[PDB]
Symmetry: C3
Subunit: 33 residues, 3 copies
């Protein structure tokens, strides 16, 4: 039960990370914050 959850979380951790970078970038190809 433990591993699965942690497995799960590092994966989620990976996605959100990539996501922030993508948004950051989309934030420039428009009007810089």
């Amino acid at each position: 039960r433990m591993k699965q959850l942690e497995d799960k979380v590092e994966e989620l951790l990976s996605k959100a990370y990539h996501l922030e970078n993508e948004v950051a970038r989309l934030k420039k190809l428009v009007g810089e914050r």
Copy 2:
């Protein structure tokens, strides 16, 4: 207890899934650099 976390990880999975979709769509729509 873990059914909890396995629940709070379940909302995150769903959150990340929609967020990924939204970001892909915009990425497409925006377009430029």
Copy 3:
């Protein structure tokens, strides 16, 4: 284990929240819904 996981889940909750917000604004700024 648990303080770590539970703390990792908060990191995640934090970021999903930020991201959602950023994405939401990004969609008003470009007219997309």
